[PDB]
Design a binder for these strands. Structure first.
Ligand SMILES: [Mg+2]
Ligand SMILES: [Mg+2]
Ligand SMILES: [Mg+2]
Ligand SMILES: [Mg+2]
Ligand SMILES: [Zn+2]
Lengths: 147, 98, 38, 122, 130, 148, 216
RNA sequence: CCCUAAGCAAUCACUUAGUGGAAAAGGAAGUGAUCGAGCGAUGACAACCAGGAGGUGGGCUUGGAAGCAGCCAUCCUUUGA
């Protein structure tokens, strides 16, 4: 708008548990931000979702304590590790292997990732190859068909 | 008629400036026991304002800039708290003192 | 001022200037980079 | 850059090929670093189909209006000369507020007079 | 190499084109540019490209889009439209402008049938349908 | 070889004549025999085995810090100059002739155009800078040579 | 069948200059130093048919700037495996062309300390003549190699291969593909993809490059 | 040139250090001559303005590492970037 943007700080909060002290303590207190109205607005929208889900919230801080935030889907590392197996990344990715996913989980994860509020127009090939590039970065294997 | 202008800012607890005779004599108080008197040369006059700001005003660019640097050279800015005489647009970078 | 027989530019704000027939390296950022050839 | 102006009026023809300097001054004067520096300063864009040549007409705080040749001088040269006049206006105002007469007059014969070096004295 | 890139980028886009415009993108961010490109790519049959003015100048030579030459100065985002429905092509910018409150980014210049209409002049032609 | 410091384990004779070393060139040109880059000499003179070892240590220590991991030993070094001439020397407070003195060290005779070092398995910039670092330990004037 | 097959490299048209020479009247270090001081490289053009009795030799001198430019741009080995046009005229700027001929640079002498050219040798190679040509190698596909991906290092045993080549189809270089070599294996001189009319002088069981395992 | 017998000798270039008229490794890049290369009116370099993103906070480490303590990978996309 016309307000002098100070910072853009991100966080991950489990769904439904927006109690403003364990993750909403010093993280938002470092930038003088409020803890009540943001938590009310956050709990006024994650009522239709499964709880204990690491929802991504980016909040644009301001000098007049105004919150203008959009809600992001949970992280693609979470989506590609929880739909695969153990959540432990490799000591040496690209050479040491943990899990394996063929073609299908990445494709439907791309379909879910299309629901990002500024991913209305990115093509599914773009999203799928981005997730393939993320999959290369923790050490999981991708094949044509696991059998 | 004057064309060439330069401005100086004085930073300090009890550091003062004053013009004496029609803008031709400059007097300064820089924390010493005595004062500092400088005679402004021809083609240049000096003026003092209410923000500890000294103006060197004149018609010859060489003499104006040389005399402004002359007034600056009486006390350069220190690096630990920036006290002294400096230029208005000049940035002084400090450092912490152990 | 560091006086030596091999002056160099140690960063990107160092300039070589020939003053009175002597080679000086002057720096705006770090005053520890001031060098004189001699 | 926007500290010293009160109103700016930009006028040009959109189908005439000499609008590069005037739209570049539009880019210079409608930046994010500009409008926060003077919230009270006004911009005035006018467009016309007829053949009035593109002009930049500005005013300052102290009632001085200046017209510039936006057809043949570039926006950056305009930006330099507005500040060249602006700092003179600021110096005039700063002298006038303190009780000094403006303009200050110095006899134009001391350029020939010899001057010794200025050595500071006790 | 980038000359060949944008030469191909305009050679593909001129294969079905019928009018061309250029928008002043002063003050528009990357996300709002992407949203304009999205609105005008799904909801219409149009395409957006920001290119070198002299390169489009050289790449439109020898073509019926040779009249454009005055209207290529400053900040130009070239919109090429591969379809014919100019009411739905030009009302999308009205909806975009009135929704996101952007008066600093307007339509400067357009080419239709060897003619450069004024920005006031291609306002009534969006009213007529088909 | 002898690890770092290079001199023969034994020789036919203990003491050798001084000889001359200020002349001599490669009369046919020079080309690299093992590596892609190399350091060759432009002048002719003597080099001691300590200087050759210091230059080799400088090159291998520059590769050690520039490239780590599995590429740390991807750089290969060939030392094509060998020091096999003993030099002698009489101590202080001794008169002129009672024979020949005890040996003190070993030298190598270097001709004009002789390749001292050869490098492979690294980048061109790393090879150039390692040659730059190694030439500051030798008394002779050297040039960087490239395979072509 | 005296033409380059498809799928093979050809000499570039960027470096297809013509070499200009003027006659030289004597041999020896005196006239050689005089020509080098004047700014010319001594040279001789000769043929194969009579090795004794000279060989229909002609003593010429070429331009130092041109020869140095050719050697610097092509490389030392690449200059020696490529044919050139030689035009010998009576004077620089004259039109009295004495001999225009298609020739191979048999050798070039470079100073061991200053690397200025001292001597160029040209051998007449019209079509139908057989030469012993040393062809450089070019190693490609080092990013695709599984052995190099696993951290092994490359051991280039040989850089140039000597062949018997008819003049018309002398390859400028040989492309060697390293896409399908893992740790432990080597390529021998019989794996080079050349023209079938070229005969390998060296035996085929000679290693060229081996990928050896890294220090685990 | 004078000291000192005989030329402020003639033509074409170069240095401005009293080099000439003592001394290296190394440093700086003044001033000429010549051979190439790279960019360039499709607009270069210097200058001014406005952007310089998304997956993503890539994982491992880890009281904390988010592009920027260390290790591995260094991909993919919209794009004008
Ligand atoms: Mg002889
Ligand atoms: Mg006399
Ligand atoms: Mg002297
Ligand atoms: Mg000297
Ligand atoms: Zn510095």
């Amino acid at each position: 708008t016309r307000r002098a943007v100070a910072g853009t700080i991100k966080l991950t909060v489990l769904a439904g548990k927006a109690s403003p002290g364990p993750p909403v303590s010093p993280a938002l207190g470092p930038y003088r931000l409020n803890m009540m109205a943001f938590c009310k607005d956050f709990n006024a929208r994650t009522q239709k979702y499964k709880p204990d889900t690491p929802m991504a919230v980016k909040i644009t801080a301001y000098m007049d304590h105004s919150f203008e935030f959009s809600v992001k889907s949970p992280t693609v590392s979470w989506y590609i590790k929880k739909a695969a197996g153990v959540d432990k990344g490799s000591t040496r990715p690209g050479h040491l292997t943990v899990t394996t996913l063929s073609v299908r989980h990445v494709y439907e994860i791309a379909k879910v990732k299309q629901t990002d509020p500024f991913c209305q127009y990115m093509p599914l090939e773009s999203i799928c190859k981005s997730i393939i590039g993320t999959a290369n970065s923790m050490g999981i294997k991708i094949v044509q068909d696991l059998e | 008629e004057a064309k060439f202008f330069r401005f100086l800012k004085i930073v300090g607890v009890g550091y003062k400036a004053r013009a004496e005779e029609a803008g031709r004599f400059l007097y300064l108080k820089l924390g010493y026991s005595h004062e500092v008197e400088l005679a402004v040369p021809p083609a240049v006059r000096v003026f003092c304002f209410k923000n500890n700001v000294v103006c060197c005003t004149g018609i010859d660019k060489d003499r104006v800039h040389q005399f402004a640097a002359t007034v600056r050279s009486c006390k350069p800015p220190e690096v630990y708290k920036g006290k002294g005489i400096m230029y208005v647009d000049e940035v002084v970078k400090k450092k912490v003192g152990k | 001022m560091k006086v030596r027989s091999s002056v160099k530019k140690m960063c990107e704000f160092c300039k070589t200037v020939k003053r009175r027939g002597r080679v000086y390296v002057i720096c705006s950022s770090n005053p520890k980079h001031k060098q004189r050839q001699g | 850059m926007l500290k010293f102006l009160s109103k700016v009026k930009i006028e040009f023809n959109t189908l005439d090929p000499r609008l590069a300097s005037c739209v570049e001054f539009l880019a210079q004067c409608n930046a994010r670093k500009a409008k926060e520096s003077n919230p009270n300063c006004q911009v005035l864009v006018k467009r016309r189909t007829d053949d009035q040549p593109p002009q930049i007409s500005v005013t300052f705080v102290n009632g001085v209006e200046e017209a510039f040749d936006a057809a043949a001088t570039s926006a950056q040269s305009i930006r330099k000369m507005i500040l060249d006049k602006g700092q003179y206006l600021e110096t005039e105002q700063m002298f006038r507020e303190a009780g000094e007469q403006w303009p200050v007059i110095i006899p134009e014969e001391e350029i020939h007079q010899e001057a010794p070096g200025v050595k500071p004295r006790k | 190499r980038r000359a060949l890139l944008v030469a191909g980028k305009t050679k593909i886009n001129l294969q079905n084109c019928h009018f061309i415009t250029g928008i002043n993108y002063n003050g528009l961010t990357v996300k709002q540019l992407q949203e304009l490109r999205g609105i005008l790519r799904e909801n219409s049959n149009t395409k957006l490209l920001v290119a070198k003015n002299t390169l489009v100048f050289k790449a439109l030579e020898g073509t019926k889009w040779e009249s454009l030459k005055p209207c290529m100065k400053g900040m130009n985002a070239w919109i090429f439209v591969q379809t014919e429905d100019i009411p739905a092509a030009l009302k999308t910018f009205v909806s975009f402008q009135k929704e996101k409150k952007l008066f600093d980014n307007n339509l400067g210049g357009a080419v239709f049938e060897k003619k450069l209409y004024g920005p006031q002049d291609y306002k009534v032609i969006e009213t007529m349908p088909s | 070889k002898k690890g770092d410091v290079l001199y023969p384990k034994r020789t036919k004779y203990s003491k050798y004549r001084k000889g001359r070393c200020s002349r001599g060139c490669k009369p046919d040109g020079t080309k690299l025999g093992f590596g892609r880059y190399g350091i060759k000499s432009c002048k002719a003179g003597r080099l001691s085995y300590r200087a050759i070892e210091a230059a080799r240590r400088a090159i291998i220590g520059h590769f050690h810090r520039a490239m780590s991991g599995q590429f740390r030993r991807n750089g290969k070094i060939w030392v094509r100059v060998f020091a096999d001439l003993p030099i002698t020397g009489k101590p202080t407070e001794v008169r002129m002739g009672r024979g020949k003195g005890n040996p003190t060290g070993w030298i190598a005779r270097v001709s004009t155009g002789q390749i001292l070092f050869e490098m492979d398995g690294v980048s061109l910039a790393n090879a150039r800078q390692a040659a730059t670092l190694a030439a500051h330990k030798l008394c002779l004037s050297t040039k960087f040579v490239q395979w072509s | 069948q005296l033409e380059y097959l498809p799928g093979f490299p050809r000499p570039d048209a960027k470096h297809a200059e013509t070499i200009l020479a003027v006659p030289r009247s004597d041999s020896g270090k005196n006239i050689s130093a005089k020509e080098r001081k004047a700014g010319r490289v001594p040279s001789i053009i000769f043929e194969q048919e009579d090795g004794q009795h000279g060989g229909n030799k002609r003593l010429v001198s070429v331009q130092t700037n041109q020869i140095r430019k050719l050697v610097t741009h092509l490389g030392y080995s690449f200059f020696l495996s490529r044919l050139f046009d030689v035009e010998v005229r009576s004077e620089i700027g004259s039109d009295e062309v004495i001999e225009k001929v298609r020739a191979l640079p048999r050798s070039i002498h470079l100073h061991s300390g200053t690397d200025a050219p001292l001597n160029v040798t040209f051998i007449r190679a019209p079509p139908g003549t057989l030469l012993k040509v040393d062809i450089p190698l070019v190693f490609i596909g080092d990013d695709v190699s599984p052995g190099l991906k696993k951290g092994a290092s490359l051991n280039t045993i040989k850089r140039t291969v000597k062949f018997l080549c008819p003049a018309e189809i002398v390859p400028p270089y040989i492309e060697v593909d390293l896409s399908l070599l893992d740790v432990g294996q080597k390529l021998v001189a019989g794996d080079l993809k050349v023209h079938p009319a070229l005969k390998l002088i060296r035996p085929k069981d000679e290693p060229i490059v081996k990928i050896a395992g890294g220090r685990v």
